[PDB]
Amino acid sequence: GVFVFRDETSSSVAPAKLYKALTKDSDTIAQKIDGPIQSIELVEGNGGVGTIKKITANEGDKTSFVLQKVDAIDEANLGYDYSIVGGTGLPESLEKLSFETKVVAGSGGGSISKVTLKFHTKGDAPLSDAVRDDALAKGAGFFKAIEGYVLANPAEY
Amino acid sequence: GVFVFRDETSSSVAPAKLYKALTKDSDTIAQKIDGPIQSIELVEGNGGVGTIKKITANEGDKTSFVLQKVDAIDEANLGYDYSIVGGTGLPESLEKLSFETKVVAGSGGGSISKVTLKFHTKGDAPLSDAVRDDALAKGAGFFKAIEGYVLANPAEY
Numbered sequence: 001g002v003f004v005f006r007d008e009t010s011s012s013v014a015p016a017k018l019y020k021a022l023t024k025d026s027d028t029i030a031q032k033i034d035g036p037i038q039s040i041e042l043v044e045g046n047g048g049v050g051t052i053k054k055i056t057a058n059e060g061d062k063t064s065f066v067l068q069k070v071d072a073i074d075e076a077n078l079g080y081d082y083s084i085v086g087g088t089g090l091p092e093s094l095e096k097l098s099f100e101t102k103v104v105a106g107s108g109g110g111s112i113s114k115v116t117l118k119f120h121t122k123g124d125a126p127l128s129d130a131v132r133d134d135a136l137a138k139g140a141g142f143f144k145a146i147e148g149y150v151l152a153n154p155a156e157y
Numbered sequence: 158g159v160f161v162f163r164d165e166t167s168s169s170v171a172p173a174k175l176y177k178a179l180t181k182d183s184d185t186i187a188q189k190i191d192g193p194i195q196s197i198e199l200v201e202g203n204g205g206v207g208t209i210k211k212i213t214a215n216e217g218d219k220t221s222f223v224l225q226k227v228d229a230i231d232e233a234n235l236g237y238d239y240s241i242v243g244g245t246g247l248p249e250s251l252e253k254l255s256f257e258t259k260v261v262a263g264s265g266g267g268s269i270s271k272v273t274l275k276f277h278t279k280g281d282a283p284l285s286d287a288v289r290d291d292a293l294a295k296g297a298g299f300f301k302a303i304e305g306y307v308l309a310n311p312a313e314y
């Protein structure tokens with residue numbers, strides 16, 4: 001089955017800048033900062049729809065990876081969708097985790113980051129809170145890492 | 158004027174550990190990771206209630222600081238309250254900003270971080286969205302930075 005969860009996050013970062021950092025510069029920033037992500041490599045494509053990326057990261061003291069697919073890109077409306085489709089980093093009860101994101105004008109020149117997660121469980125397995133919350137936690141952690149990088153480097157943004 | 162805002166975040170980190178990191182190890186962690194925070198000075202007190210900490214940060218293209226005061230500590234119930242009473246880092250429209258935090262166990266094994274922020278505006282003046290959102294953005298940034306550290310160093314926790 002499909003489980004949907006929507007969330008919004010405000011930021012002082014201007015829309016155009018945030019969108020660029022999250023969708024075009026994130027792979028580069030993630031390997032640059034001291035976070036969980038250790039390496040990102042293109043398995044297929046170079047960024048456009050259909051692209052498959054292998055992301056290797058450290059979960060505690062162990063390494064795992066996920067395969068990521070680029071579902072859609074609407075640069076005109078600052079939209080970007082993609083999903084995690086495999087790898088050892090993907091919970092056993094999950095078949096696919098899809099993200100639908102959009103950046104809109106926020107308050108005081110800042111923006112609003114809207115995200116819709118869609119959990120596709122394996123064999124209609126139930127979605128435990130633990131699995132759902134861990135994904136939200138990782139999604140929130142990654143977002144803050146990029147936003148934080150943007151805020152700390154005004155010459156670049 | 159006094160404006161209130163609440164929030165809850167679920168974490169996979171056990172209660173006691175998340176609490177120790179946020180309230181006892183954070184001063185050191187902030188200096189170990191590369192974030193906005195540059196230094197933490199104990200101006201008066203040793204960390205117990207009544208303590209005044211001076212926190213300095215590199216806001217990217219400029220520097221600023223805030224005076225933090227420890228309002229209450231309840232180690233038994235994993236409670237910790239404090240507030241920003243001054244510094245160039247505190248917006249002019251604000252007189253004081255208070256935080257009331259608590260960590261409770263999740264029903265399934267994690268922990269939930271509850272936070273209540275109380276904005277004290279200067280004499281009936283309204284609270285601007287920009288000020289409100291920026292404050293929330295920094296609070297979440299700090300929290301996630303500390304949560305990230307624990308998850309990346311299971312050996313230490």
Ligand SMILES: O=S(=O)(O)c1cccc2cccc(Nc3ccccc3)c12
Nearest residue numbers: 055056057064065066089135138139142
């Ligand atoms: O694709 S990520 O941008 O890291 C990613 C981003 C946002 C939310 C995520 C949730 C679960 C797993 C991920 N991947 C993962 C990657 C390596 C090891 C373990 C898990 C998530």
Ligand SMILES: O=S(=O)(O)c1cccc2cccc(Nc3ccccc3)c12
Nearest residue numbers: 207208209226240241242243252253277
């Ligand atoms: O009286 S408070 O309600 O905290 C307070 C409330 C509102 C604004 C304040 C500004 C400076 C100092 C305070 N007090 C203070 C008290 C003890 C130690 C350090 C500072 C302020």
Ligand SMILES: O=S(=O)(O)c1cccc2cccc(Nc3ccccc3)c12
Nearest residue numbers: 212213214221222223246292295296299
């Ligand atoms: O993160 S703090 O350790 O207080 C902090 C430390 C050092 C310098 C700071 C400068 C501006 C804002 C802060 N924080 C802030 C957080 C929430 C609401 C309003 C201001 C600063």
Ligand SMILES: O=S(=O)(O)c1cccc2cccc(Nc3ccccc3)c12
Nearest residue numbers: 144147148151193214216294295298299
């Ligand atoms: O807004 S900043 O200019 O970085 C910033 C400046 C000054 C003090 C800060 C204190 C805590 C968090 C921030 N932001 C943050 C936001 C997202 C992720 C990590 C940290 C602070």
Ligand SMILES: O=S(=O)(O)c1cccc2cccc(Nc3ccccc3)c12
Nearest residue numbers: 036057058059060138141142301305308
């Ligand atoms: O849960 S972690 O084991 O760190 C983790 C492990 C593996 C891949 C991750 C990918 C994105 C975010 C995480 N969390 C995160 C949480 C807080 C701050 C920054 C990143 C990831």
